[PDB]
Design a protein around this ligand. Structure first.
Ligand code: PZA
Length: 167
């Protein structure tokens, strides 16, 4: 049993809810929250901007030190950093950004990072300002992630479309 509440069960391991991932993280304090990161860990907008704002910019300070030491992530890659006030850990995962012309086939590689964690609170990778079709992102998630993932969808309209179109 875990603390996640109000989720619709899509599969054996994938759950979904219409929710603000910041508000959900603040309530649950999950072991892992996933950030929709870019390779530079520049948390300017979308899930990343909202998560970083909720940490009072501590996520960005930590991230800048990580990049200064290690250099940029790969598209499809990830790193584990602090979850600050939101979670124990933040898994920063880089999905392809369609608005930068990145290979959508890298979305499966991105979701494979989730398999290193038994339970996660996450957004749909490459959705929102990353430009991918969120229906596609949910299908790749279900077909790739084997660990238990609780998906928070910010938009109510999109949530209802994801549920009502789910195969
Ligand atoms: N939870 C949010 O504030 C958020 C903002 N932008 C995109 C997705 N989620």
């Amino acid at each position: 049993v875990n603390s996640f509440s109000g989720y619709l069960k899509l599969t054996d391991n994938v759950y979904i809810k219409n929710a603000d991932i910041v508000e959900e993280a603040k309530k649950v304090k999950p072991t892992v929250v996933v950030n929709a990161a870019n390779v530079y860990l520049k948390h300017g907008g979308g899930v990343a901007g909202a998560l970083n704002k909720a940490t009072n910019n501590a996520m960005q300070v930590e991230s800048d030190d990580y990049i200064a030491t290690n250099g940029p992530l790969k598209v499809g890659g990830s790193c584990v950093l602090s979850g600050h006030n939101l979670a124990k850990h933040c898994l920063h995962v880089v999905g392809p950004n369609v608005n930068k012309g990145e290979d959508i086939q890298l979305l499966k590689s991105a979701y494979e990072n989730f398999n290193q964690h038994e339970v996660l609170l996450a957004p749909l990778l490459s959705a929102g300002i990353f430009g991918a079709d969120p229906i596609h992102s949910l299908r790749v998630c279900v077909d790739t992630v084997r660990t238990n993932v609780y998906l928070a969808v910010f938009d109510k309209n999109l949530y209802d479309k994801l549920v009502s179109s789910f195969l």
